[PDB]
Short mmCIF file of C-alpha atoms in Angstrom, two decimals:
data_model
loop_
_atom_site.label_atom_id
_atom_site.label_comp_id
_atom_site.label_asym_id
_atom_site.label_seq_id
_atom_site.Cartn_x
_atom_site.Cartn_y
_atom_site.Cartn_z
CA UNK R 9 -14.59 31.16 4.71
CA UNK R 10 -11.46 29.56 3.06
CA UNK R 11 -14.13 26.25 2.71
CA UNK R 12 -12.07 23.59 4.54
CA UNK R 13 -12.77 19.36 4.09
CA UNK R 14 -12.70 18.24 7.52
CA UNK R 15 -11.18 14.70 7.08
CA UNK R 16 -13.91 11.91 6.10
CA UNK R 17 -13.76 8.31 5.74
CA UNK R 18 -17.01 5.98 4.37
CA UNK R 19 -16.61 2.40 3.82
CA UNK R 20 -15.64 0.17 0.58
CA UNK R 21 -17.94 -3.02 0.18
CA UNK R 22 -16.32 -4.49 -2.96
CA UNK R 23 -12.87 -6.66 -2.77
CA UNK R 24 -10.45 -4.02 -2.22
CA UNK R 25 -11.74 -2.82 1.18
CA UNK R 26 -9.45 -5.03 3.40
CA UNK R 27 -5.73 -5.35 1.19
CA UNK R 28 -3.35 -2.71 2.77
CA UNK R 29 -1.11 -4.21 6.10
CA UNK R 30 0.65 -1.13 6.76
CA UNK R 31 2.14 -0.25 10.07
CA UNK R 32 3.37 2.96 10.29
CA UNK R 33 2.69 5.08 13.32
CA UNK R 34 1.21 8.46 12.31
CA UNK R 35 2.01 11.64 14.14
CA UNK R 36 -1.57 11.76 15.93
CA UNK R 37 -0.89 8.16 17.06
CA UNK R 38 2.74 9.16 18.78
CA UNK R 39 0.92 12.37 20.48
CA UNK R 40 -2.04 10.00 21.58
CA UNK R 41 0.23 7.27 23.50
CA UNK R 42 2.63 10.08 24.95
CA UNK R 43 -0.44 11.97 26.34
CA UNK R 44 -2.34 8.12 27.60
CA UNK R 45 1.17 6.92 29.30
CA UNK R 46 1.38 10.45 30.82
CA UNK R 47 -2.20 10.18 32.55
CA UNK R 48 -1.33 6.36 33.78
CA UNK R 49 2.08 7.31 35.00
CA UNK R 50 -0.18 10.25 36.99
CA UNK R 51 -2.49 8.36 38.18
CA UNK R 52 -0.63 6.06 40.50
CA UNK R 53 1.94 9.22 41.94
CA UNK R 54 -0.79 11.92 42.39
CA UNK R 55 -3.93 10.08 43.26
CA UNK R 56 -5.82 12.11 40.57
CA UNK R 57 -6.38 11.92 36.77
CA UNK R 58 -7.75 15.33 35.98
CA UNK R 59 -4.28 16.06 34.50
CA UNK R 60 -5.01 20.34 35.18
CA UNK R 61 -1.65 20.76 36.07
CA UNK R 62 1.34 17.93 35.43
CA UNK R 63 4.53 18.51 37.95
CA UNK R 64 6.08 15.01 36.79
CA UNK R 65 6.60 15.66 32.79
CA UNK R 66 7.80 19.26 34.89
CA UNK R 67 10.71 17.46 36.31
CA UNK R 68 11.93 15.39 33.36
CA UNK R 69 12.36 18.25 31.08
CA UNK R 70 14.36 19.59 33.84
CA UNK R 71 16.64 17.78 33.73
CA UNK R 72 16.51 17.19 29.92
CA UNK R 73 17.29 21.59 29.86
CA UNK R 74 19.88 20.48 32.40
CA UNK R 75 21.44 18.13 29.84
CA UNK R 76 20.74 20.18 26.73
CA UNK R 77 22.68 23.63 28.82
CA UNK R 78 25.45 21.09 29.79
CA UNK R 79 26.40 19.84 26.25
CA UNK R 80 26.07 23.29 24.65
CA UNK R 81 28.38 24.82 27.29
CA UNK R 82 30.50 21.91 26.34
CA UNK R 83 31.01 22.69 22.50
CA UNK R 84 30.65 26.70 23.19
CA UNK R 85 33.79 26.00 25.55
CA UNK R 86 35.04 23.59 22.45
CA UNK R 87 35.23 26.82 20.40
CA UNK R 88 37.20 28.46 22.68
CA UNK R 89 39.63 26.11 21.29
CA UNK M 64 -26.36 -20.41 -17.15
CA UNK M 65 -23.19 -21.86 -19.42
CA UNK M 66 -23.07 -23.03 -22.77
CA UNK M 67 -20.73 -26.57 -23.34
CA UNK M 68 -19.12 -28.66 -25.40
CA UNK M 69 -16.44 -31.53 -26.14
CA UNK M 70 -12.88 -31.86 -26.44
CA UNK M 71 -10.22 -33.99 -26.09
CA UNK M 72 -8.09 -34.52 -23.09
CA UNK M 73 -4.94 -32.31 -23.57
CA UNK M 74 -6.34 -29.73 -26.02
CA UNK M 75 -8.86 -26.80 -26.94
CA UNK M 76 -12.76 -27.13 -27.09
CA UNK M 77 -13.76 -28.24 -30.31
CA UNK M 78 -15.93 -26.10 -32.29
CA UNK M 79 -19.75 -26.69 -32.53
CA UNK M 80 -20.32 -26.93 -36.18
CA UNK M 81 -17.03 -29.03 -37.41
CA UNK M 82 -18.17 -32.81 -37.08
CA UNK M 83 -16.25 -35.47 -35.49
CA UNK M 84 -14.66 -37.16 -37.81
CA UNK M 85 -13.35 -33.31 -39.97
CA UNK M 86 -12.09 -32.85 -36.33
CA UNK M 87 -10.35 -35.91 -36.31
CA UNK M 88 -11.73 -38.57 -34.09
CA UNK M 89 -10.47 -41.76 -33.92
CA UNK M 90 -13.25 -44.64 -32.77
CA UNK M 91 -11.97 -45.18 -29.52
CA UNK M 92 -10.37 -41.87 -27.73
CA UNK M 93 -11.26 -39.93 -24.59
CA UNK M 94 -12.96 -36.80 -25.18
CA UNK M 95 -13.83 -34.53 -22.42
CA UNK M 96 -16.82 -32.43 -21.60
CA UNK M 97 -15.20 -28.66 -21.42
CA UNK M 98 -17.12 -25.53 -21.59
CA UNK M 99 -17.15 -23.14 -24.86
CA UNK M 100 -13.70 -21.07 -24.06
CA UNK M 101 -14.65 -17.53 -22.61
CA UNK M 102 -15.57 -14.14 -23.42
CA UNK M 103 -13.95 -11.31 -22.97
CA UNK M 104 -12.15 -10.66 -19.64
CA UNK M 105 -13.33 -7.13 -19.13
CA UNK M 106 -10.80 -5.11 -18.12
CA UNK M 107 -10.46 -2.89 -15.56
CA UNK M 108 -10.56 0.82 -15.76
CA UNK M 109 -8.85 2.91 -13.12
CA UNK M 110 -7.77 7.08 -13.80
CA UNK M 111 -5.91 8.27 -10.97
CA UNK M 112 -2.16 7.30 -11.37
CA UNK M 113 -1.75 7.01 -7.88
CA UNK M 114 -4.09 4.18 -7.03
CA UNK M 115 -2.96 2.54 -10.55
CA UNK M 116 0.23 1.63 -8.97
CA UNK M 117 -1.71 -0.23 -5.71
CA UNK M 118 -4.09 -1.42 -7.56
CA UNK M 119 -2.50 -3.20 -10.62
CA UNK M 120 0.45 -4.58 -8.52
CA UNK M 121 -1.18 -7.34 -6.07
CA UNK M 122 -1.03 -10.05 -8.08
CA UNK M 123 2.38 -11.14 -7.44
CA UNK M 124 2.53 -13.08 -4.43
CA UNK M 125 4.16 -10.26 -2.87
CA UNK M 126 3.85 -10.05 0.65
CA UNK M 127 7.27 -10.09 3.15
CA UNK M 128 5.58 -12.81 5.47
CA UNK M 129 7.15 -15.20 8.33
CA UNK M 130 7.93 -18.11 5.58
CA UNK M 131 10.02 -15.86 3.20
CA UNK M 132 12.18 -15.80 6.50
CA UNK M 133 12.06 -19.79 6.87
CA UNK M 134 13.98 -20.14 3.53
CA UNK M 135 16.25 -16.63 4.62
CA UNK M 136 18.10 -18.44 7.08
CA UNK M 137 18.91 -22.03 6.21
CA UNK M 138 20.05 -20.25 2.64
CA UNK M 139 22.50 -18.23 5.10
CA UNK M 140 23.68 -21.25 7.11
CA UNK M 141 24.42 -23.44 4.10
CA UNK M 142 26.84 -20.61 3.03
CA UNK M 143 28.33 -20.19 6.51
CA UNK M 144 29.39 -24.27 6.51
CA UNK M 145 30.38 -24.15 3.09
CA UNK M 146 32.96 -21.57 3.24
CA UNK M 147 33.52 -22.28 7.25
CA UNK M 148 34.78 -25.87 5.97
CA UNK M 149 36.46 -24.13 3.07
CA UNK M 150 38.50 -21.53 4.87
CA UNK M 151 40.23 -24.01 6.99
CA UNK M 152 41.02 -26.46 4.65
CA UNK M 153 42.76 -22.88 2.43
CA UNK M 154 44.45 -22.50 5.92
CA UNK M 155 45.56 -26.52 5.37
CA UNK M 156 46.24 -27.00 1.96
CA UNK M 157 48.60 -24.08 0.81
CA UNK M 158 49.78 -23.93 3.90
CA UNK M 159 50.11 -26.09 6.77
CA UNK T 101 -4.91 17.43 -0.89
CA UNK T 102 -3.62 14.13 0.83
CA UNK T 103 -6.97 14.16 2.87
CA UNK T 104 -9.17 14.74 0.14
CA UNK T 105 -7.54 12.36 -2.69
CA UNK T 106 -7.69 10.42 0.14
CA UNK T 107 -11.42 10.15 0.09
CA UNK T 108 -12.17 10.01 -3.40
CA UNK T 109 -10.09 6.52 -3.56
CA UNK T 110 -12.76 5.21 -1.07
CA UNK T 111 -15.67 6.91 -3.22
CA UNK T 112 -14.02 5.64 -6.40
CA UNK T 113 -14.05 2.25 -4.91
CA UNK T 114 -17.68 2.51 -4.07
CA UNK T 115 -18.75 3.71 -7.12
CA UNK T 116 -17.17 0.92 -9.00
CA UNK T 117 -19.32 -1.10 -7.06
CA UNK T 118 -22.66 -0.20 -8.28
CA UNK T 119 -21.58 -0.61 -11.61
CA UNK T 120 -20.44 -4.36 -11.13
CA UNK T 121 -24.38 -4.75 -9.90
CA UNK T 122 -25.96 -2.97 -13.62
CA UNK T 123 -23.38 -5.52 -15.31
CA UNK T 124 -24.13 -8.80 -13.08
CA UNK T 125 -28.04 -7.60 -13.55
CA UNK T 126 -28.00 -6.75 -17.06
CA UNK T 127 -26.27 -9.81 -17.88
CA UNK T 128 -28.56 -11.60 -15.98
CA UNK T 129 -31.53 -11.34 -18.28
CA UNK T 130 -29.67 -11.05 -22.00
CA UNK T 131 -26.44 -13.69 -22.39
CA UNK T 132 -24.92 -13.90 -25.80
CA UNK T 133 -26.65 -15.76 -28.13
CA UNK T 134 -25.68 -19.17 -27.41
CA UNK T 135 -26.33 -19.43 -23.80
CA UNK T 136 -29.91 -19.13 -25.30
CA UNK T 137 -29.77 -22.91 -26.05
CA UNK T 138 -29.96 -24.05 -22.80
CA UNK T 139 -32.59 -21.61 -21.54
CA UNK T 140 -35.72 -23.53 -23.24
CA UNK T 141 -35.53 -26.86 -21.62
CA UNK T 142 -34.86 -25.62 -17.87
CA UNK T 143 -36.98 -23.81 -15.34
CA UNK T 144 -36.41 -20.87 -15.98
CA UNK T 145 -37.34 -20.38 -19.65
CA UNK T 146 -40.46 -18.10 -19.94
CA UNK T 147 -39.80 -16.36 -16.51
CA UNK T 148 -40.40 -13.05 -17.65
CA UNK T 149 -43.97 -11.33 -17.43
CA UNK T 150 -45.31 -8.15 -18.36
CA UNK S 33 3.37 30.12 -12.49
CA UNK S 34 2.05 30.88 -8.84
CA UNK S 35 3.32 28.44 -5.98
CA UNK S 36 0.02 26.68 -6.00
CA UNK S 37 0.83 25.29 -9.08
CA UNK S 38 4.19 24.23 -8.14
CA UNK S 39 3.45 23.47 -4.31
CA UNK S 40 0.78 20.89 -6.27
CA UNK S 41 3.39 19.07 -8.62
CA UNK S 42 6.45 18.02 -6.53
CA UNK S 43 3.12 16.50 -4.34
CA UNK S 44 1.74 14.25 -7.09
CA UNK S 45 5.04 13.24 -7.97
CA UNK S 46 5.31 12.09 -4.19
CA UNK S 47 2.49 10.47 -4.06
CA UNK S 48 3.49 8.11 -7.29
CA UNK S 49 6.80 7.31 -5.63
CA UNK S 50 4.90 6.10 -2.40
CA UNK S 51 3.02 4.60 -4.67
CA UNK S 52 5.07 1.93 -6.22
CA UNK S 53 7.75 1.35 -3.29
CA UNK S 54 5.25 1.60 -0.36
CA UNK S 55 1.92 0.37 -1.85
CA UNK S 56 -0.44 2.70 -0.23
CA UNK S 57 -1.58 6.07 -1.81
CA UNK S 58 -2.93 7.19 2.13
CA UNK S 59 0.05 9.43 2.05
CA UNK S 60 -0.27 10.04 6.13
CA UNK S 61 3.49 9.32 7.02
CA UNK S 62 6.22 8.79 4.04
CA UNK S 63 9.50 7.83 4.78
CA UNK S 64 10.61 7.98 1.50
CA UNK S 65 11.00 12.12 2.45
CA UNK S 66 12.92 11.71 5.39
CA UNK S 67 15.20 9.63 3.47
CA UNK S 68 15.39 12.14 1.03
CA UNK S 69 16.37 15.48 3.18
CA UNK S 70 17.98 13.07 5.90
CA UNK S 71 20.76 12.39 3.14
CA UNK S 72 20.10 16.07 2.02
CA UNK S 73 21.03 17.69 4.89
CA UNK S 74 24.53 15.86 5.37
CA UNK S 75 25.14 18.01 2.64
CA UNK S 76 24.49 21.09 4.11
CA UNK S 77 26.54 20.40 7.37
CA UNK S 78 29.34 19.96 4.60
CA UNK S 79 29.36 23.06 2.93
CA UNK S 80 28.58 25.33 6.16
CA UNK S 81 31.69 23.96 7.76
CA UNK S 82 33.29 24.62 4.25
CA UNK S 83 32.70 28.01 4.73
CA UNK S 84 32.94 28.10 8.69
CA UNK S 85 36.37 26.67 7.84
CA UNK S 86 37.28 29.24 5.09
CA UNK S 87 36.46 31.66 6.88
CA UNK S 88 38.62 30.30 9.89
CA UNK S 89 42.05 30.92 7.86
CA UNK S 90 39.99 34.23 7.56
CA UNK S 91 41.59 36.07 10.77
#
């Protein structure tokens, strides 16, 4: 096809093959430790890890949409000023 | 496997075909026992630009580390007294 | 491109490896000539064989 | 010209910068670019309220 490089990494065995300390959390990390804290925080409320269908992460965002449809009522009200 | 030779205390190796007294011995001084100087150093060779800028760049001693904080803060402090003691004594002197 | 680059640093590192072996070998067996001096009177003088 | 060719520039010349300041060629996450359009954008939010606000004497 379009011949894609799936990601690789071998190992180094000369000096420079432990000389970076660099924290910097990369997107795939973030995504991994919302997804493991949102299978431990459903795991002592539901009694069951399988994760199919996830009714807590449900209620949060609605009340995030609740917050988000507050504040732009608030400015689109703002404008009517 | 190194080659050596002799040289006096505070100065370069002495070469191995001069003889000590065109070298300038004196009967009575320290020489030491020092190896013949070096050869080349060999440099490096690196292409990509990008890893010529990691690469080159270590050896300075460079790393942030919990002791270049040790001498942050009692450089901050000594300034804080300094113009702590000198701000009152402004607020004593030209005024009262 | 930041995936591939990526991995040629770590094969340009490994590469430059072997080479540091050739030139630690191939200066095993031919220093300049004036280690030579010392190589008659120790153990190691005639090692080679055929 | 074709994008390809420019699309591969403006990266190499990123991943120099991270190069010197950040001391790792990985490239994964760069700050460096947020700072960039982070500062970039409080320009734009200037000149769209320019013209929002022009266009408010407009009526």
């Amino acid at each position: 096809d379009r011949r894609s490089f799936s990601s690789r990494t071998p190992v180094n065995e000369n000096p420079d093959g432990v000389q970076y300390r660099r924290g910097f959390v990369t997107r795939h990390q973030v995504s991994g430790w919302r997804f493991v804290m949102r299978r431990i925080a459903s795991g002592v409320a539901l009694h069951d890890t399988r994760m199919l269908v996830d009714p807590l992460r449900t209620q949060s965002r609605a009340v995030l949409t609740g917050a988000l449809i507050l504040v732009t009522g608030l400015v689109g009200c703002f404008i009517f000023s | 496997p190194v080659r050596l030779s002799l040289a006096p205390i505070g100065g370069a190796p002495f070469s191995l075909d001069a003889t000590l007294d065109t070298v300038g011995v004196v009967d009575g001084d320290l020489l030491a026992l020092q190896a013949v100087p070096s050869g080349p150093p060999a440099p490096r060779i690196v292409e990509d630009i990008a890893d010529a800028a990691v690469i080159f760049s270590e050896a300075r001693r460079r790393q942030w580390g919990p002791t270049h904080i040790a001498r942050g803060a009692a450089l901050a402090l000594i300034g804080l007294i300094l113009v702590g003691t000198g701000l009152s004594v402004a607020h004593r002197v030209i005024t009262g | 491109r930041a995936d591939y680059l990526r991995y040629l640093s770590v094969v340009r590192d490994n590469v430059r490896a072997h080479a540091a072996e050739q030139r630690a070998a191939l200066e095993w067996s031919h220093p300049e000539p004036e280690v030579l001096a010392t190589i008659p009177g120790t153990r190691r003088q005639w090692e080679r064989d055929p």
